[PDB]
Amino acid sequence: WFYVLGENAVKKLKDMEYLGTVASICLHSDYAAALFEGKVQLHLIESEILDAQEERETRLFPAVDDKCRILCHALTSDFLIYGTDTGVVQYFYIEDWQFVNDYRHPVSVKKIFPDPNGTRLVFIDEKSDGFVYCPVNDATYEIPDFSPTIKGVLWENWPMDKGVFIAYDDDKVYTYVFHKDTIQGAKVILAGSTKVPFAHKPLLLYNGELTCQTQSGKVNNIYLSTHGFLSNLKDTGPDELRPMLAQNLMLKRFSDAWEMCRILNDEAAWN
Amino acid sequence: SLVRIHCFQGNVQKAAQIANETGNLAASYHLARQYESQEEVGQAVHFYTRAQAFKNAIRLCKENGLDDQLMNLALLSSPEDMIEAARYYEEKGVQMDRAVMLYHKAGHFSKALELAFATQQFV
Amino acid sequence: HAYDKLRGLYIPARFQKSIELGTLTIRAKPFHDSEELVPLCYRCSTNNPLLNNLGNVCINCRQPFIFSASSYDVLHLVEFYLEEGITDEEAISLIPFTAKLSFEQGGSEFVPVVVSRLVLRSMSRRDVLIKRWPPPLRWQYFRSLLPDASITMCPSCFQMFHSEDYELLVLQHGCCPYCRRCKDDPGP
């Protein structure tokens, strides 16, 4: 069942029936993507009958009717993305209605999680191993120390931290950083771990603040342990500021790191 | 830029008022091109002449057969361009009075005499 | 191809943000370039690829491209050279050409167009541009291959333009945009 999020009221649009039990559904732009019988249906949320091509109202994947089964999918501002039992990851561009990247992993791809644009993906394989995939250069980077208990992944929405993501299970969140541009070449690094209260489910990451759903239906916010420095530095002086400095150096936020070194007034901190 | 934005808004009259009052050559040129696109040949030639862009006005006159406005453009131009205009009339054969007048006003008596002989213009 | 070349360079953060979105949003689009953008060589009538390893020369005849200093469009001009024993003043007094440009095509290196007294007599002064450099430089001669599309050239810096662009730029700036000579200034 689909609903419009208008400013004054919420309106039910329609109900839709699929060919089998829906495993998951994703929404972006005017479009929804639903996974059921090991196949994905992409479709419009709103149909106006005049002046559109019928093949753009809905499409089924994989569209060639190959023997491979889709196990997972995601939807961005531009791309339908999905992963298969044959280990294939595919990008379909929505505006020109065509495939645009294809990668094959040695084993099946079990789950996928794009950044807010689609330019980085995290995928989890049949061995529960996590990988960052960059469709823009077709490269894959193995995520270090990735726990097989991980249920999902969220990317950071804050502008200084575009390479930051988190992976989570029932007990913990792990904070990861993809360093793209460095002299050693691109790599994924574990920055730390944060304990999650019982049965809280992560929904949004923003500036190291993690919004979680509780068993009571309410939301609750958790600041990541990798972000404790965001507290007011002046009252502990160096103690919250030194981990701020280290992180702001690594995030290239050097205008913040300058004010921190001004507070320390140490020839070593300037060096 | 005022005439450009007024022309874009469809207010061509206010643009023309600004171009007339200011005397700006670039504004008069732009306005002339808009009038050219609207096929208003007389206003286009006027504003090209006000912009001192005699060559565009000459071309637009030659394409529309405005031999009268070509004569005004010739009489405003140098004696060489008077002779080139005389030659354009001499090639048509219809305006041989303006041709001989322009050769005589340009001071080129040999060709004024040869063409007045050829056209039997005794006056 | 331009977004893949950018990834070989040290991109600043403002451009990096736009380039991440730009890389996705192009790779999404079709895999071809619009035919209307592809530059014609006017000497050999060959369509040239939008970037090439030889630079600002035709891939077929190796003719150097001549560009409008307003817009950097290729100008329907071919540079030509006087035959031995003709002076610059004699060449102007004299001022078949297309039949040379059709013959010389398909060679391995650039060949300059060389022009005799008979071919100079067959030209018209309306079609020919002459760069009157100060000594020690020799004068350079160019033929327009589309007389209906007018070209203008600055008498100070010898930069070449479409005539409408040059008149509009001189009206905007009160002077030549390249060398700042005013329209009312008598030449050297």
Swiss-Prot record, chain A:
Some isoforms are tissue-specific. Highly expressed in the prostate. Lower expression in the cerebellum, pituitary gland, fetal lung, and pancreas. In normal prostate, expressed in both basal and luminal epithelial cells. No expression detected in fibromuscular stromal cells, endothelial cells, or infiltrating lymphocytes. Uniformed expression in prostate adenocarcinoma cells. It is found in: Cell projection, Cilium; Cytoplasm, Cytoskeleton, Cilium basal body; Cell projection, Cilium, Photoreceptor outer segment; Cell projection, Cilium, Flagellum. Induction: By androgenic hormones. Expression increased 3-fold in an androgen-stimulated androgen-sensitive prostate adenocarcinoma cell line compared with androgen-deprived cells. Component of the IFT complex A (IFT-A) complex. IFT-A complex is divided into a core subcomplex composed of IFT122:IFT140:WDR19 which is associated with TULP3 and a peripheral subcomplex composed of IFT43:WDR35:TTC21B. Interacts (via C-terminal region) with IFT122 (via C-terminal region). Interacts with BBS1. Interacts with TTC25. It is linked to Cranioectodermal dysplasia 4: A disorder primarily characterized by craniofacial, skeletal and ectodermal abnormalities. Clinical features include craniosynostosis, narrow rib cage, short limbs, brachydactyly, hypoplastic and widely spaced teeth, sparse hair, skin laxity and abnormal nails. Nephronophthisis leading to progressive renal failure, hepatic fibrosis, heart defects, and retinitis pigmentosa have also been described. This is WD repeat-containing protein 19. The lineage of its organism: Eukaryota, Metazoa, Chordata, Craniata, Vertebrata. The chain holds residues 409 to 679 of 1342 of the full protein.
From Swiss-Prot, chain B:
It is found in: Cytoplasm, Cytoskeleton, Cilium basal body; Cytoplasm, Cytoskeleton, Microtubule organizing center, Centrosome; Cell projection, Cilium. It comes from the Eukaryota. TPR repeats lie at residues 25-58, 93-123. Component of the IFT complex A (IFT-A), a complex required for retrograde ciliary transport and entry into cilia of G protein-coupled receptors (GPCRs). Plays a pivotal role in proper development and function of ciliated cells through its role in ciliogenesis and/or cilium maintenance. Required for the development and maintenance of the outer segments of rod and cone photoreceptor cells. Plays a role in maintenance and the delivery of opsin to the outer segment of photoreceptor cells. Component of the IFT complex A (IFT-A). IFT-A complex is divided into a core subcomplex composed of IFT122:IFT140:WDR19 which is associated with TULP3 and a peripheral subcomplex composed of IFT43:WDR35:TTC21B. Interacts (via C-terminal region) with IFT122 (via C-terminal region). Interacts with TTC25. Interacts with TTC21A. It is linked to Short-rib thoracic dysplasia 9 with or without polydactyly: A form of short-rib thoracic dysplasia, a group of autosomal recessive ciliopathies that are characterized by a constricted thoracic cage, short ribs, shortened tubular bones, and a 'trident' appearance of the acetabular roof. Polydactyly is variably present. Non-skeletal involvement can include cleft lip/palate as well as anomalies of major organs such as the brain, eye, heart, kidneys, liver, pancreas, intestines, and genitalia. This is Intraflagellar transport protein 140 homolog. The lineage of its organism: Eukaryota, Metazoa, Chordata, Craniata, Vertebrata. The chain holds residues 986 to 1108 of 1462 of the full protein.
Swiss-Prot record, chain C:
Expressed in many tissues. Predominant expression in testis and pituitary. It comes from the Eukaryota. It is found in: Cell projection, Cilium; Cytoplasm, Cytoskeleton, Cilium basal body. Forms the trimeric core subcomplex IFT122:IFT140:WDR19 via the C-terminal region, whereas it interacts with IFT43:WDR35 via the N-terminal region containing the WD repeats. As a component of the IFT complex A (IFT-A), a complex required for retrograde ciliary transport and entry into cilia of G protein-coupled receptors (GPCRs), it is required in ciliogenesis and ciliary protein trafficking. Involved in cilia formation during neuronal patterning. Acts as a negative regulator of Shh signaling. Required to recruit TULP3 to primary cilia. Component of the IFT complex A (IFT-A) complex. IFT-A complex is divided into a core subcomplex composed of IFT122:IFT140:WDR19 which is associated with TULP3 and a peripheral subcomplex composed of IFT43:WDR35:TTC21B. Interacts with IFT43:WDR35; the interaction connects the 2 IFT-A subcomplexes. Interacts with IFTAP; the interaction associates IFTAP with IFT-A complex. It is linked to Cranioectodermal dysplasia 1: A disorder characterized by craniofacial, skeletal and ectodermal abnormalities. Clinical features include dolichocephaly (with or without sagittal suture synostosis), scaphocephaly, short stature, limb shortening, short ribs, narrow chest, brachydactyly, renal failure and hepatic fibrosis, small and abnormally shaped teeth, sparse hair, skin laxity and abnormal nails. This is Intraflagellar transport protein 122 homolog. It comes from Homo sapiens. The chain holds residues 1017 to 1241 of 1241 of the full protein.
